[PDB]
Amino acid sequence: SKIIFRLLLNVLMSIIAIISYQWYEQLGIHLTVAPFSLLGIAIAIFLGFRNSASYSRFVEARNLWGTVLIAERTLVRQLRNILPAEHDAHRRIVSYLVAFSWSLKHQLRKTDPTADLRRLLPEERVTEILASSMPTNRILLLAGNEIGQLREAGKLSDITYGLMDNKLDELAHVLGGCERLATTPVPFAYTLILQRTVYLFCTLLPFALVGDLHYMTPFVSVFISYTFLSWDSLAEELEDPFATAANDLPLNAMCNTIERNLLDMTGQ
Amino acid sequence: SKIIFRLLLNVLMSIIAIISYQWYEQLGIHLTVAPFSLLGIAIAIFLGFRNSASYSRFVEARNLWGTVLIAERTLVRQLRNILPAEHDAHRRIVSYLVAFSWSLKHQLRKTDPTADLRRLLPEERVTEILASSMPTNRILLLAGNEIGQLREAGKLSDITYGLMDNKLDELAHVLGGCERLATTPVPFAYTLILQRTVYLFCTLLPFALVGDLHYMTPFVSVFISYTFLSWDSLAEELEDPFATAANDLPLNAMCNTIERNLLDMTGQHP
Amino acid sequence: SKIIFRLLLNVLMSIIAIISYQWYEQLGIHLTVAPFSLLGIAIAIFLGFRNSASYSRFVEARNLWGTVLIAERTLVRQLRNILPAEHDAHRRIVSYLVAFSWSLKHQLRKTDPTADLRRLLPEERVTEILASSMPTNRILLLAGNEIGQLREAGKLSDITYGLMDNKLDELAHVLGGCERLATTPVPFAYTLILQRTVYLFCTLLPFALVGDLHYMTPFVSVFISYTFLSWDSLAEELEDPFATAANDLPLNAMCNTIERNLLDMTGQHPLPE
Amino acid sequence: SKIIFRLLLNVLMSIIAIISYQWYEQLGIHLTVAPFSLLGIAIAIFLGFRNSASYSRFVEARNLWGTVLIAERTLVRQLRNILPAEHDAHRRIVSYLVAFSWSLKHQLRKTDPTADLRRLLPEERVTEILASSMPTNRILLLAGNEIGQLREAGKLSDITYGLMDNKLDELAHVLGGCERLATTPVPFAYTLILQRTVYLFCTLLPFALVGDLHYMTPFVSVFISYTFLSWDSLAEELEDPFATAANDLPLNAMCNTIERNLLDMTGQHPLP
Amino acid sequence: KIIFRLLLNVLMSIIAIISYQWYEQLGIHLTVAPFSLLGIAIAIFLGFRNSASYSRFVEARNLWGTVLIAERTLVRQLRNILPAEHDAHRRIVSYLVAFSWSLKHQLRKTDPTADLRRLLPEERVTEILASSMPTNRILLLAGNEIGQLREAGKLSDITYGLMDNKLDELAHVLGGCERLATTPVPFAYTLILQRTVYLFCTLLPFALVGDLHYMTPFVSVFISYTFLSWDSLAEELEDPFATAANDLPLNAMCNTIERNLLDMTGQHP
Ligand SMILES: N[C@@H](CCC(=O)O)C(=O)O
Ligand SMILES: [Cl-]
Ligand SMILES: [Cl-]
Ligand SMILES: [Cl-]
Ligand SMILES: [Cl-]
Ligand SMILES: [Cl-]
Ligand SMILES: [Cl-]
Ligand SMILES: [Cl-]
Ligand SMILES: [Cl-]
Ligand SMILES: [Cl-]
Ligand SMILES: [Cl-]
Ligand SMILES: [Cl-]
Ligand SMILES: [Zn+2]
Ligand SMILES: [Zn+2]
Ligand SMILES: [Zn+2]
Ligand SMILES: [Zn+2]
Ligand SMILES: [Zn+2]
Ligand SMILES: [Zn+2]
Ligand SMILES: [Zn+2]
Ligand SMILES: [Zn+2]
Ligand SMILES: [Zn+2]
Ligand SMILES: [Zn+2]
Ligand SMILES: [Zn+2]
Ligand SMILES: [Zn+2]
Ligand SMILES: [Zn+2]
Ligand SMILES: [Zn+2]
């Protein structure tokens, strides 16, 4: 919300344009409104499409996280329905699945998963997971071992193993999705072009408006400025949905909901 | 329609603009249409996009609900097709699937599912369901136990169990999808910014219009005001598709349809 | 075309604009182009977004019917490749799949399917289907019984059953999709808001145009009006793609195509040496 | 372009507008920019959305054809991986898969597939396929029989049969997708209505521009017309991606790509 | 490379100023209004186009994502299902890594021989370079490894099926990338817009001069920048497999894939 600084700067640019309107003819500078409508409308169209792309990206982040909840739910359900007896296996997989949620969060947030992982897994596993450059992936592999061992123990057939393997695939896609979102930002050129253009437009605007609106200039100018900046900053906040900002995803809340959901499903 | 108030208030502002037009040069105020055209078209573009995004949420909401009927239909079908004899299993599973629907509706409406659950299931189950933090997910698990037990008893093979398991996974996707839409709407910036913007534009508009239209100012002002507000409030409505507004989903109607479908003729089949 | 009444009314609205142009400022009423440019554009943006939604809905409808053909083709093909000898089963399943198509058509068209169902199926089955509150879904169940009986008999394994079952799932999605599109229209509020704004904008336009064009008003006002009315009525035809309008789906032809297709894949009287 | 006729008719309309503007006052017929500006922007928005839909259809066609390549590749891969010894089967299936591609291309183009089928299949099959009203569908069924026979011989299990059968479903989905996409006039005359709206706008525009640009009318008026006519005709092209009035290069290229690919995969190499 | 036209705009604006005094002398009028109409039209058309170009970029980024995902899970499956078959692990992983690099080369239209020799025995490198599509060949070879394990009875049809599905997924990636390479948005699009945006940008000062006088160049360059920025950004996103500044870092992505697959096989980069 550094926007209020930019709004103040606009009012200052407006009064400058008022006081210096007297010297217009003298300096030989003529500025009509029509060419600034053309520019403004274009910027609005471009901002419109840009804002759209940003929203889609935010939506995708939400979906991928939604999939974690879904896929981890059904995997646990599958475990209970196929092997209701093997509570030993349940606890191990549920922990791994809960670890995955937290590991992914920390990975995306660029924070330290050590505390959460130690809260969930034995140390032999925790140090092994943190040993991998890709810890979240390492958790999936370990979760895969449990299903694999259950198959080798003959407790799962190839079919029932396959039924569960699909859920690990689903989470692999989530990990992939999130990494792609995190590592690949919306092209820097989008923020580079638009911010330059919008800021300079808002700044130059009163100098074209002053000829027409005179004193009313500051009000009409700041209002158009507000509109364009608000739209522009919304797209900025949507672009990176894994940031810690107030407009972003409450990942902690989701990870807690996932953890509570799985522990609820095992009677813990 | 809370638009009518703002539409009426717009006519009041339009009278103010007519009577105060003479005094423009005295008060040192000049207002042309051109700047408001620029601002208006920009607001229209942004409203245009916003509304589209809202309709999307509505459409996805509707699709998620359509999947319930589809996946529930086929699961029953599969049961009727693979185990045509097991009517006791049929009835138990159906009642769960029906419970899932009503439970989901209550969840998204944040209302009490107790009445509907008792109507459908034994009390030992109603307490088990209301015990859970997520009752709808609990219902899925119970539905799952039924399919699971038919496999323990060797009535279902791994293959046919899987075929039916797939359908529960489908419902789980519906559950998660709906939660996504419900628990977190669009950003809160979207609503508070645009609503203020659209109305501040609407109130200032006559003051800029009066120069051109004079008396016809209130007419053309309320027209534009309507067009902009109509779109914003509709967008606002469709953003929460699980709410109780006019343009939202008839979830009650939908849950009936699901129920009637699953109990086709008291759950009978040749 | 009930659009042509609105164009005539536009001509008449232009004419009164021309003649009553005198008693304008004498009262004090003024109408310029720039404010109607803003409104017009706002309306054009809103129409554009709505039409987009309507087209999507039309595409989806076309897509869903597209799937019926794909799924029934493959289900018949699967029966041919897995159980090549069982032509009794073929004809039974084929007929149900044809029945499904016609039943679904009648359901969306809100017409009686008894004729078609009797043409295709024995009377016990027509009774069975019409007894259901959801007849088309009942046909799928019956189709599923055929596959299920072949599994009971051990002619199909659980795998081969599964392969065929998943095709019924496709048809189940089609049925659900179509029903959804039939009962969930583009929210009425859209069609309501746009219908009011477009009509009001078209009638007031020649009054806001007369100042600038004087006599040329009727010729310009109509051209603008027609544009907004054409684009609006395009959406109103695409939102209801199951009726018997000019823009709607030829569901009868498509049903024939499906009946033709399945009787092309079968129909080869087998065992003639 | 072939739209250079309407660009010339524009310049001719400009010259009419210049010379005749003198006799405008002696009636009281005027044309400002403001109304035609509104009309133009409105049309542009509509053209914008229409074009978007067209491009969408074009992309979907490219996807469906891309799937033929993918599915036909993986089916052949599966055959080599699961039944490496069964080359006679490899050959027959590959024949049908290549047949499917060409037969689909011909179907959508409404052109004669005889030559292409004759190069790939015995005249017995070619007659059978062309006897059917749905020849591409027939080829899929024939390819299916081949996979089915390997199963009945016990060479494929129900699982491995399933795996390959899935690929034939993909091709079936593609055939249907293409059939829908080729034979779907989503608007009846609304593609012509908007086209005529662009036509009239472009021919009335100089009469509205003359007051402001005078002689520079033809210069600006043709440029505006060019933009509108180009965008309209582009949407018209993308609308019908399988049209005889479209580009055949990509469709023929793909059929050759798939053929080259499938022969490479079975080591047969080029077919004469 | 745009700053050449940004300059040419200022020059054309100067021409517009110095030749404004000859305007009525020649009898040429240019108002802003008709250029607003044309400007907005182009802005709408650029707006949609840029949107389309983005989709291609996102799809390409998505397809490459699947490579990481599909290969990760394929290795995971090998480890979970055949934990003792480390010969198979290494061979398959080498093919998966080969596929990644070969795809990078395929799309960039470069020579894969360097990378192939680093990863595979020489007989295979020949077999691969012999094929019309080398990447497709690598998948077939990866498929042979799974197929061999099946005949040996180490994999059931079901477990073979599970692994096969991942090769199918990569085939889809191959097809997808191939489609985004070989088929750009047709010739028409760029030939229309690029010329149109240019001609508009250079003719705009002539129309702006009346209203703006000297301020012409400043306003005209501002509009021109906006229109050209958007136009060129769209062009960069259109071809996502190029080596341009705002394009997929395919070298970096292939490293990530290789590192991930090494990590999973208990090896070190
Ligand atoms: N393989 C071609 C021969 C022509 C050529 O390669 O030039 C055919 O028989 O159709
Ligand atoms: Cl437990
Ligand atoms: Cl997957
Ligand atoms: Cl438990
Ligand atoms: Cl289903
Ligand atoms: Cl029952
Ligand atoms: Cl799932
Ligand atoms: Cl007044
Ligand atoms: Cl038959
Ligand atoms: Cl061969
Ligand atoms: Cl995967
Ligand atoms: Cl390993
Ligand atoms: Zn799932
Ligand atoms: Zn347990
Ligand atoms: Zn223990
Ligand atoms: Zn630490
Ligand atoms: Zn389903
Ligand atoms: Zn029953
Ligand atoms: Zn007045
Ligand atoms: Zn299918
Ligand atoms: Zn038969
Ligand atoms: Zn595939
Ligand atoms: Zn071979
Ligand atoms: Zn002059
Ligand atoms: Zn995958
Ligand atoms: Zn190993």
Numbering used by the authors:
A (entry chain D): 22 to 289
B (entry chain B): 22 to 291
C (entry chain A): 22 to 294
D (entry chain E): 22 to 293
E (entry chain C): 23 to 291
From the paper:
Human bestrophin1 (hBest1) is a Ca2+-activated Cl− channel essential for Cl− transport in retinal pigment epithelium (RPE). Although the structure of hBest1 is still unsolved, two Best1 homolog structures, one from bacteria Klebsiella pneumoniae (KpBest) and the other from chicken (cBest1), have been previously reported. Overall, the channel is a pentameric assembly with a single ion-conducting pathway, which varies in diameter along its length and is constrained at two narrow points: a “neck” contributed by three residues (I62/I66/F70 in KpBest and I76/F80/F84 in hBest1/cBest1) on a transmembrane helix, and an “aperture” formed by a single residue (I180 in KpBest1, I205 in hBest1, and V205 in cBest1) on a cytosolic helix. Here, by electrophysiological and structural analyses, we show that the neck and aperture in hBest1 are both indispensable Ca2+-dependent gates, and their dysregulated opening by rationally designed or patient-derived mutations causes Ca2+-independent leak and elevates Ca2+-dependent channel activity.
Alanine substitution mutants for each of the 12 residues were generated in KpBest and hBest1 and subjected to crystallography and patch clamp, respectively. Moreover, the equivalent KpBest mutants (W16A, G18A, S19A, L259A, P262A, G264A, and D269A) all showed an overall similar structure to that of WT KpBest. The corresponding “Ca2+-binding” sites in WT KpBest are occupied by Zn2+, an essential component in the crystallization buffer. Interestingly, the KpBest P262A, G264A, and D269A mutants show no Zn2+ in the corresponding sites. In KpBest G264A, the methyl group of alanine, which is bulkier than glycine, may inhibit the binding of Zn2+. Moreover, KpBest L259A, P262A, G264A, and D269A all have relatively low resolution and slightly altered structures in this region, suggesting that the binding of Zn2+ stabilizes the channel structure.
